[PDB]
Design a protein around this ligand. Structure first.
Ligand SMILES: CC(=O)N[C@H]1[C@H]([C@H](O)[C@H](O)CO)O[C@](O)(C(=O)O)C[C@@H]1O
Length: 308
């Protein structure tokens, strides 16, 4: 086709993220009357989110996904998006990004500094903790070899609750869990299902610790080359796909607890009071290390009312 574009993602071909990406690709091809084709490159074939973000800056990849929190890699105060228990729900994540001065400044910085245009935002689940032994209480986290992604906020989650974080790549996790070289991991339910981590974890704790969004991103290199009518086609299709993306996650969080129960998994509901208490020292370190931009991002996020 005239523009042969590529969409890279960490997620696999059974994931919600991929399904929404298929919808995005399909609308774009149609409403562009065939001028744009978007091919999918899942399962981190192109490298992980960090790597793919660098390919979008360079212009060697055209689209990818990223959480708002992943931009803590460049702007330390963007960690606020993933300080555990700080963002209440997805309504708060939406207003954080689009309706605060911090948020709006982060978007403009994404474009001018990092070579990426934010097209849409979806919901990608609330993270929970699976494991090979029960998590009845925060005490059960002691010495747990918990698999985390390569991100400072997830490592901090593990540390401060008394677990032993082993960072690793997503594609590696399943075997690690099965052999028990690690004891647990902490994705939203959707990914626990997509990656089938429920086949090699008898236990799931509802730790509700981090709220993931997902941003549909396009390389500026690619976006600037598209005529404005085709820019609007890609922009609209990204908003349509985001809304669908959010619905897949919302509908699944209802039904998946029962799906895991049927699959022989044992669900616990530990007291979150001490989880939340364990993090105050981390919030203090966060303000200490990120300074006044950081206390100003927290202030703006904590002021957002979580009720629609
Ligand atoms: C857009 C994207 O790639 N998200 C990925 C996130 C982020 O990389 C991480 O949370 C840091 O923000 O990590 C996972 O949860 C993980 O490796 O377990 C998989 C998920 O697909």
């Amino acid at each position: 086709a005239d523009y042969d574009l590529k969409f890279g993602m960490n997620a696999g071909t059974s994931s919600n993220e991929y399904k929404a990406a298929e919808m995005f690709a399909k609308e774009v091809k149609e409403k562009s009357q065939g001028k744009i084709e978007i091919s999918l490159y899942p399962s981190s074939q192109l490298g992980d989110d960090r790597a793919m973000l660098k390919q979008l800056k360079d212009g060697s990849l055209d689209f990818t996904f990223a959480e708002s929190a992943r931009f803590q890699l460049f702007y330390p105060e963007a960690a606020v998006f993933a300080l555990p228990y700080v963002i209440s729900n997805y309504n708060v994540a939406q207003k954080a990004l689009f309706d605060t001065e911090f948020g709006k400044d982060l978007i403009k910085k994404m474009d001018k500094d990092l070579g990426v245009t934010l097209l849409s935002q979806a919901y990608n689940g609330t993270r929970q903790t699976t494991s090979n032994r029960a998590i009845n209480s925060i005490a059960d986290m002691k010495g747990l070899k918990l698999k985390v992604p390569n991100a400072a906020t997830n490592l901090a989650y593990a540390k401060y609750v008394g677990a032993s974080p082993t960072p690793m790549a997503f594609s590696e996790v399943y075997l690690a869990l099965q052999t028990n070289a690690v004891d647990g991991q902490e994705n939203p339910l959707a990914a626990v299902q997509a990656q089938k981590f429920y086949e090699v974890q008898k236990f799931l704790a509802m730790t509700n610790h981090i709220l993931n969004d997902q941003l549909y991103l396009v390389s500026n290199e690619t976006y600037k080359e598209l005529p404005e009518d085709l820019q609007k086609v890609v922009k609209d299709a990204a908003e349509n796909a985001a809304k669908y993306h959010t619905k897949l996650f919302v509908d699944g969080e209802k039904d998946l607890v029962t799906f895991f129960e049927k699959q022989g998994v044992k669900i616990t509901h530990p007291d979150l009071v001490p989880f939340k208490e364990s993090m105050k020292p981390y919030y203090a370190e966060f303000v200490k290390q990120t300074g006044q931009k950081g206390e100003s991002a927290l202030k703006q996020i904590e002021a957002i009312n979580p009720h629609h």
